[PDB]
Structure formats: C-alpha cells, structure tokens
C-alpha cells in the first residue's frame, strides 16, 4: 500500500486540546481515488475547508494523510468529535466494486490500528466510532450495507450501530495486536 503524507488541510482547525479519544471510520460516498480526494482538498480555500475534511483518505492502493493527527479535523460536525477523534475516509459509494471497497476498508483499519497503538488506546466501543454517533448522517453507508446489511435512509438503529462498531473493532484489533501484519 502506498503511503502519502501531504497535509493539504493546512491545520486550519488548530491543534487538538486534550487526549485522543479514538477513531471514526467514514466512507466518502464517492468512487474517486484517495489522490483525487487529496487534490480536491488541495484546491480548496481555507474557507472552503470549513465544509469538512478528515485526517486520512484511503482507497484500495493508497493511504493519504491529509491532516497531521495532532491537529483537529472537521469530520463529524460535533466539537468533541472533531477535537478528540481521528477521522479515516474510505473510498466507497454504490458503484465501487466490492473487492476495491473491502481493500480500501482494510487499509483504513490498518492505519487506525497504527494510530490507536501509537496513542496507547484500547480498541473497543469507546475508541472506535461511527460518524452517525456524533451527528445525523447515513455514514459509513457502504460499510453499513456490506457488513450489517443496512441500506437505508432511516436513522441507524442503535443495535446496528453496535454491530458496525464491533465489526470495525474486530478488524482494527487484528492489526493493532499484530503490528507486523500488512493490510494487503
Ligand atoms: Cl463523510
Ligand atoms: Cl467547521
Ligand atoms: Cl462488485
Ligand atoms: Cl446523534
Ligand atoms: Na467526501
Ligand atoms: Na470541504
Ligand atoms: Na470528507
Ligand atoms: Zn462520515
């Protein structure tokens, strides 16, 4: 997997105050490459970045760190979420091929495990969260369809949220506990 560190989000949200609390696994609900996502952010004004961005963008081949993890990111429309949780964007919409989406997901899980291990956090329901636990959204919609069978515009039910967390936790913990394991 190609690793690219390029902080195109320019630190506009400022440094995190306080400890890291966990990670949020997003889906872009687009079918663009991680590099296309990076270029899109690089071409925005700092005002346009106010619409939102994450710390990493991942596709089947690439992990791009678009914001240093010591900075906040405007990724969940919630102040404590934006301050305390690191955001991972997985390439994935309805058109993305299954195997491409699943590889992209694994790349994000591997990077999330690296960061949880670095900050010394456990891998559990406190530290692995979904965007819709912070604010109203269907995200992570493709993960929800693939792993929970939930393809809907209704607000994600609590039992499905827990199931999606547990899936994310199982994948992240596999990398967390096995530091030499690679996502490909
Ligand atoms: Cl999103
Ligand atoms: Cl904002
Ligand atoms: Cl397919
Ligand atoms: Cl909510
Ligand atoms: Na997006
Ligand atoms: Na934006
Ligand atoms: Na985004
Ligand atoms: Zn999201």
Residue numbers in the entry: 2 to 185
From the manuscript:
The results revealed that only the catalytic amidase-2 domain (aa 2–185) was crystallized and its 3D structure was determined at 1.97 Å resolution. The absence of the C-terminal domain from the resolved structure was due to protein degradation, as discussed in another section. Analysis of the resolved structure revealed the presence of a β-sheet bundle structure, comprising of five β-strands: β1 (amino acids 3–6), β2 (amino acids 23–28), β3 (amino acids 57–60), β4 (amino acids 63–66), β5 (amino acids 86–91). The bundle is framed by four large α-helices (α1, α4, α6, α7) and 3 smaller ones (α2, α3, α5). This secondary structure forms a characteristic cavity in the middle of the structure. The presence of a zinc ion (Zn2+) was observed inside the cavity, although no Zn2+ was added to the crystallization buffer. The zinc ion in EfAmi1 structure is coordinated by two histidines (His27, His132) and a cysteine residue (Cys140), which are highly conserved. The tetrahedral coordination sphere of zinc is completed by a chloride ion. The architecture and size of the zinc-binding cavity indicates that it most likely serves as the binding site for the peptidoglycan. However, Thr330 in LysGH15 contributes to catalytic activity as revealed by the finding that the Thr330Ala mutant demonstrates a 50% decreased activity. Therefore, Glu90 and Thr138 are predicted to be key residues in EfAmi1.
In the present study, a putative cell-wall lytic enzyme (EfAmi1) with predictive amidase activity was identified in the prophage sequence integrated into the Enterococcus faecium 11C6_DIV0699 genome and characterized. EfAmi1 is composed by two domains: a N-terminal Zn2+-dependent N-acetylmuramoyl-l-alanine amidase-2 (NALAA-2) domain and a C-terminal domain with unknown structure and function. The amidase-2 family includes Zn2+-dependent NALAAs that cleave the amide bond between N-acetylmuramic acid and L-Ala in bacterial cell walls. EfAmi1 exhibits broad-spectrum activity against both Gram-positive and Gram-negative bacteria.
